[PDB]
């Protein structure tokens, strides 16, 4: 049988390719590792004829450097030029770039009328992450890059962090060629993982040679895997996105809450425990979780058993292992793979969450600052237990608990349980039409980056 | 199961190094994305042409109701999440029949789809496109909210009045439309479809048979496409 294998290092394979390949050591094309390049032209207030001319000339220089894809084959950079203001509009689509010449003609002739509305740069990020980058070419080493241009300094608001998290979740590495330095934005980008964005400063008039060098070599052209050490990244942007290395003393505390035999067929249960085991494998458990003050701990909890309705003397949940119950990653992984078993009971979601947070998190010694509660729901949640559950969630959100919801199957309603996940629900709430989807890259990457979004 | 397989190295090499010939090994295109509750307004456009027929209209009705059911519809006109659905049927007269505007009123859409009546008359694709643009997007009520992307679904066999095709395509392009046409038949002009698709042939779904709308695989793929 087996769950699955371990992927080899992406950079090692790429290097082994580009030295035994009579198709790579020729000309030095800029958009290596094909990319979808989104250009969010700033058509907001404070942008006049001259400013738009300069911005379009910067875009023209960049696209002149690139090599636009002209076939079904997955290579070259495909350019989508949108213009963003209080609203967002699309001028060039990814599939519209059939040839480089016609794309350049469209960009040069692009004369979108200047607007007189505020700069909703966060709306631009959300739209680019969700809509523009929805349908993109299949590829594991494909890159998603958006070059946002900003002239009016941003403001420190929660929606900015929400949009940054959405960008990170969608797999898109932003790049803000700001005209002026705004501390609020660069602080907002400072949620650092292997897909963290950056903000530059757009100079005046000429002197764009070194500026283009900086904005191309470190961000668009290669940006990865031999990243031109004189970039400042510090090897902080490889493929196969993960969180920061062990050097980051991340004080995470994750508790998973599963479902009973009610709509958790052994197939779905196997998939959920596989996902949990993979998530643990990609974390940093404390060597001694009982007495250590730093590092991480995990717990997995199942929904209520059958003999929990007439009374509440027994735990409303089958606590499979508390936070400080396993001190070694291998032991926990083996327990999840082999020792786990269903229990054939009812759900009672709100009571389960309350008991788990009141007798698994708090009971453990030295609680971590940031703690996460994952709910893996695979069945209908009766409305009578909806409200109470949400009420409990509110309390858990007051004590600092970030929530991840994974609705599995079609039976689970999504209209009501969407709000359970912490804000923004787009990234924290996840949908899977099948259990198998839990073990696919779009969700494994989200799980890996989960410590970053919290 | 290996972490990467023959197809994974296939695409690795085809991506990092280059291509030749283009030969297409394996099948991995347009990864799309498992849909969140992002706001999407889906407009369905049905063929009133004599060729479509009666039981074909019934199968298309079943498909439309099924997709409207499966998707997580919205709850108000200005909803920022979920999705909305509308149906249009272009026939003879310029004032095409509005089966229902963009609605989340699931009972309303079900009863309307039950009460919508086949036209069975000549029609024009461009006429239907312009009528939909001027009767849903430009409609005073139930118009596509700006933050919600618009997706035009074309239940057209392809053989239909072409009058105002390039003009209709330009009008759709202006309104930031993302058409996804369905070709239900074997005698479909690929070129009018390409014009309808606004450039991309991955936005046109070719069907082996009229009842292909009911197959679970096609339903799932299309649902992921629009949502």
């Amino acid at each position: 049988r087996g769950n699955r294998g371990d992927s080899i290092d992406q950079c090692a394979l790429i290097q082994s390719i580009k030295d035994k390949c009579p198709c790579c050591y020729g000309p030095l094309e800029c958009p290596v590792f094909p990319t979808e390049l989104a250009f969010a032209l700033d058509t907001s207030e404070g942008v006049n004829q001259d400013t738009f001319g300069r911005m379009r000339d910067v875009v023209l220089s960049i696209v002149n450097v690139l090599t636009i894809a002209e076939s079904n084959c997955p290579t070259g950079a495909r350019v989508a030029v949108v213009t963003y203001n209080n609203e967002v509009t699309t001028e060039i689509r990814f599939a519209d770039s059939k040839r480089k010449s016609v794309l350049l003609d469209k960009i040069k002739n692009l004369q979108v009328a200047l607007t007189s509305k505020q700069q909703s740069l966060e709306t631009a990020m959300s739209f680019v992450a969700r809509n523009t980058f929805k349908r993109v070419r299949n590829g594991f080493l494909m890159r998603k890059v958006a070059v946002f241009f900003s002239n009016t300094p941003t403001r420190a608001s929660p929606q900015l962090r929400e949009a940054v998290l959405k960008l990170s979740d969608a797999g898109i590495t932003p790049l803000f060629l700001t005209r002026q330095e705004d501390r609020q934005l660069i602080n907002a980008l400072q949620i650092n993982n292997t897909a963290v964005g950056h903000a530059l400063v757009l100079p005046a008039g000429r002197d764009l040679t070194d500026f283009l060098e900086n904005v191309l070599t470190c961000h668009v052209c290669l940006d990865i895997c031999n990243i031109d050490p004189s970039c400042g990244f510090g090897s902080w942007r490889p493929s196969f996105r993960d969180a920061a290395a062990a050097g980051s003393d991340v004080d995470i505390d994750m508790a998973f809450i599963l479902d009973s035999a009610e709509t958790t067929t052994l197939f779905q249960f196997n998939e959920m425990k596989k996902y949990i085991a993979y998530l643990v494998r990609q974390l940093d458990m404390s060597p001694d979780p009982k007495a250590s003050q730093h590092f991480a701990r995990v717990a997995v909890v199942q929904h209520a058993p059958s003999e929990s309705v007439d009374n509440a003397s027994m735990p409303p949940v089958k606590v499979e292992f508390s936070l400080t119950d396993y001190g070694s990653k291998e032991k926990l992984v083996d327990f999840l793979s082999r020792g786990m078993t269903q229990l054939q009971g009812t759900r009672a979601l709100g009571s389960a969450i309350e008991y788990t947070i009141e007798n698994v998190f708090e009971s453990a010694p030295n609680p971590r600052d940031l703690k996460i509660v994952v709910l893996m729901l695979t069945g209908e949640v009766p409305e009578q237990q909806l409200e109470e559950a949400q009420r409990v969630i509110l309390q858990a959100k007051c004590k600092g608990y970030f929530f991840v919801v994974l609705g599995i199957g079609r039976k689970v309603n999504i209209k009501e349980v969407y709000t359970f996940a912490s804000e923004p629900n787009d990234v924290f709430f996840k949908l899977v039409d099948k259990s198998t989807e839990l073990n696919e890259e779009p969700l494994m990457r989200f799980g890996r980056l989960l410590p970053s979004f919290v | 199961d290996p972490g990467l397989t023959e197809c994974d190295v296939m695409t690795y090499v085809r991506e990092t190094c280059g291509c030749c010939d283009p030969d297409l090994p394996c099948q991995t295109e347009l990864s799309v994305a498992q849909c969140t509750q992002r706001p999407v307004d889906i407009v369905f456009l049905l063929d009133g042409s004599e060729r479509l027929g009666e039981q074909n209209f019934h199968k298309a009705r079943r498909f439309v109701e099924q997709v409207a059911r499966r998707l997580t519809l919205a709850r108000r006109d200005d909803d920022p999440l979920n999705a909305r659905v509308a149906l249009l049927q272009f026939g003879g007269p310029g004032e095409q029949q509005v089966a229902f505007p963009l609605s989340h009123n699931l009972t309303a859409i079900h009863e309307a789809l039950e009460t919508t009546q086949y036209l069975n008359s000549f029609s024009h694709v461009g006429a239907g496109v312009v009528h939909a643009i001027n009767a849903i997007v430009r409609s005073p009520r139930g118009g596509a909210r700006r933050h919600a992307e618009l997706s035009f679904v074309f239940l057209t066999d392809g053989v239909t009045g072409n009058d105002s095709l390039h003009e209709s395509a330009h009008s759709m392009r202006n309104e930031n439309v993302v058409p996804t046409v369905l070709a239900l038949g074997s005698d479909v002009d690929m070129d009018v479809l390409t014009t309808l698709s606004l450039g991309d042939r991955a936005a046109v779904f070719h069907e082996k048979d009229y009842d292909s709308l009911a197959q679970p695989g096609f339903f799932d793929r299309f649902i992921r496409w629009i949502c």
Binding site: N3, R4, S7, C21, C23, S337 | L4, V9, V13
Partner: peptide, 25 residues
């Protein structure tokens, strides 16, 4: 269950690489 292999290693990866890019310079 067992952790699946690392995929095409050595023989397989080299075979594929010399199979695709056998038509360029």
């Amino acid at each position: 269950g067992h952790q699946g292999p690392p995929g095409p290693d050595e023989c397989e990866i080299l075979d594929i690489i010399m199979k695709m890019c056998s038509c360029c310079e």
